[PDB]
Design a binder for this molecule. Structure first.
Ligand SMILES: Cc1cc2nc3c(=O)[nH]c(=O)nc-3n(C[C@H](O)[C@H](O)[C@H](O)COP(=O)(O)OP(=O)(O)OC[C@H]3O[C@@H](n4cnc5c(N)ncnc54)[C@H](O)[C@@H]3O)c2cc1C
Ligand SMILES: Cc1cc2nc3c(=O)[nH]c(=O)nc-3n(C[C@H](O)[C@H](O)[C@H](O)COP(=O)(O)OP(=O)(O)OC[C@H]3O[C@@H](n4cnc5c(N)ncnc54)[C@H](O)[C@@H]3O)c2cc1C
Lengths: 344, 344
């Protein structure tokens, strides 16, 4: 039986998986998404400054480091699986169940679901689920691909307007279709007005997408004025959508094992990642305790704590904490090529 | 008046300085040592795995990143100054005093002194304080400089024996002088016996150092057998000393402002970096609270918490936490060259 099932592969669950491995626990890691990272996947292009010990660089670069670390001890990773129940059969015997009916057993459970399940708002056009493999975007990880391109952005929110300005620096042109009701960034908009190669189209929506003959890429877009109904069709190289996010977090309200909650979104942590049920621990944005910050740094220290507390739940007389990695024997073989590279 | 005085420039105090700056507070940072880093300076060559988001690399490399981050907002840094007192004149008015009689004022105080003041045990030979600028070592940051060198190591502890084996891989020869009483690493010693270019010298001490004619480097060493008194003089390229550490931590026992303590070494944190005195906060290894780990990751999340709590002490209705760096306006100008490098 697995020592611990970790539900959620954001920064907190990833680090928890790593530290659980450091404490010599077998790990099962589960996430509903097709990729790990959680909310970090929402802002890949943004420069992160406030992670301890890390010089500022794009979030997506930091995410890749965090995943590699999280998966170092080779946990059993279940992607594309939504957890819908947590049951405690007995001490050191838990059941975690997915919406597809899979049931996973463990001696402990770590809940790391953060803000829950989050996806970008899908463009309301049939049927465009194939263009998101190519030139229909819901994130922007870098701007390089847009050099000398004609680019369409849909949305008037801060994110869309910032994207528009930055992409316009190297793109041939940027067109922004939006509703004025969505515009909360007054200064961001004024900047776009002064960008010579940005065309602002208020009261305008994407109505249809025109695919190429291979039907694998967007070739043109049919735009519609929301009052006049006037339509025109314009060629674009890329289409970027920023319509907000769909959020879903039903697990802890529907679960068999009820935990004391801080609010309707957060588990009450008892001074740390300890929950109201022994054997279940909560780390990251999902938990509230007095030492929390809404930071990745806190998600990390939470993950160490959860792994430690799970270990001593499973082994009452195990060491309260993990051995420092610097002198940890589990890394001795792996350290060899690193030293050799760095010290010789 | 400075917003906050941070006592101690280890990982926790460094990150606290950074995050205090993120919260738009003016910072004074003080450390007794000639360089920042605290206990990290003790293990520069060791590979660190358990800092969240950081791929394994030498501690000294990670330290340099941590210092650069810690000093980003250009705090007022006082090196080589030992803090001996903390006084609270009134709310938002603290006095921090050094052993040289300097008195620094602030609206808040963050205590980040970790395990206190630590220095390697100095070789008991007059007068060798000048060779430590050149080839008398108390740390080993990398092995490269010892290639084809004849190297002397004094000490039988785990650190000395590990150093000896690793240096012997590329050094011409390694001689280890030690007392058997100090040997706790049975297997480390057996390895050295099989190292062909390692000479083991139990019951032997460094008696004298013979300088070069410039008197700037060690040229030869006079070794003495601790029983027979037999002496011989051997040429070495480098001398490395591992005799343990001198430790001193009198501040919180001698201070004017008495804090509730966890033990004789640790301040009691009230669920977090909050101490028994409003306006004073403790972060890192110095504090005990229920969410602690003896990790740099916890030192970091502690530092964010201390900065946050100090801010709201100074400004009762300031935001409870800092704005995430990704969207923080203070970084907008600095981000430009970074984006440009990374995103364009
Ligand atoms: C736009 C933005 C900017 C930010 N910038 C910064 C910054 O600069 N610095 C910083 O420190 N923090 C920043 N943050 C906050 C940081 O992203 C979060 O603190 C961190 O992501 C929380 O990590 P987590 O693992 O606890 O939760 P999450 O990141 O939310 O990960 C939760 C994971 O659990 C999965 N999951 C959830 N539920 C279920 C279920 N029922 N079954 C299966 N799987 C499931 C989700 O798919 C998700 O992958 C920012 C946040 C936002 C949104
Ligand atoms: C050999 C070793 C291996 C380790 N390996 C790891 C690892 O792999 N991963 C990990 O996460 N952790 C590791 N640690 C632990 C980590 O080093 C500590 O958790 C961390 O250094 C604590 O940081 P700190 O800022 O709280 O305290 P410290 O590092 O102790 O820094 C305290 C600073 O305050 C200064 N100071 C103190 N007192 C006074 C005074 N009265 N006046 C002025 N200045 C003052 C000191 O000079 C010092 O610079 C290791 C520790 C040791 C010793």
């Amino acid at each position: 039986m697995k020592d611990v099932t970790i539900i959620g592969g954001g920064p907190s669950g990833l680090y928890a998986s790593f530290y659980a491995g450091l404490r010599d626990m077998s790990v099962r890691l589960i996430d509903v998404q097709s990729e790990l990272g959680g909310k970090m996947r929402i802002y890949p292009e943004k420069i992160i400054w406030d992670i301890g010990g890390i010089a500022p660089k794009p979030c997506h670069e930091i995410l890749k480091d965090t995943i590699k670390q999280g998966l170092y001890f080779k946990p059993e990773v279940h992607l594309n699986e939504r957890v819908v129940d947590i049951r405690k059969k007995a001490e050191r015997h838990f059941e975690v169940e997915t919406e597809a009916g899979e049931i996973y057993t463990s001696k402990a459970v770590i809940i790391a679901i953060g803000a829950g399940i989050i996806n970008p708002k899908q463009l309301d056009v049939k049927g465009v689920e194939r263009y998101q493999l190519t030139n229909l975007h819901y994130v922007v990880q870098s701007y390089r691909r847009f050099k000398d391109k004609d680019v369409l952005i849909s949305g008037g929110g801060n994110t869309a307007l910032d994207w528009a300005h930055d992409i316009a620096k190297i793109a041939k042109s940027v067109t922004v279709v939006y509703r004025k009701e969505d515009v909360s960034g007054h200064e961001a908009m004024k900047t776009l007005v002064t960008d010579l190669n940005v065309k602002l189209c208020p009261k305008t929506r994407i109505k249809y997408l025109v695919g190429n003959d291979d039907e694998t890429h967007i070739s043109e877009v049919v735009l519609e004025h929301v009052e006049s109904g006037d339509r025109h069709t314009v060629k674009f190289d890329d289409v970027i959508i920023s319509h907000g996010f769909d959020r879903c977090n039903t697990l802890l309200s529907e679960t068999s094992s009820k935990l004391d909650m801080h609010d309707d979104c957060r588990v009450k942590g008892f001074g740390n990642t300890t929950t109201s049920i022994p054997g279940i621990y909560a780390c990251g944005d999902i938990v509230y305790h007095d030492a929390k910050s809404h930071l990745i740094a806190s998600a990390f220290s939470d993950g160490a704590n959860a792994a430690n507390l799970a270990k001593t739940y499973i082994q009452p007389d195990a060491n309260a904490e993990g051995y420092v990695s610097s002198h940890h024997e589990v890394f001795k073989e792996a350290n060899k090529t690193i030293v050799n590279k760095h010290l010789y």
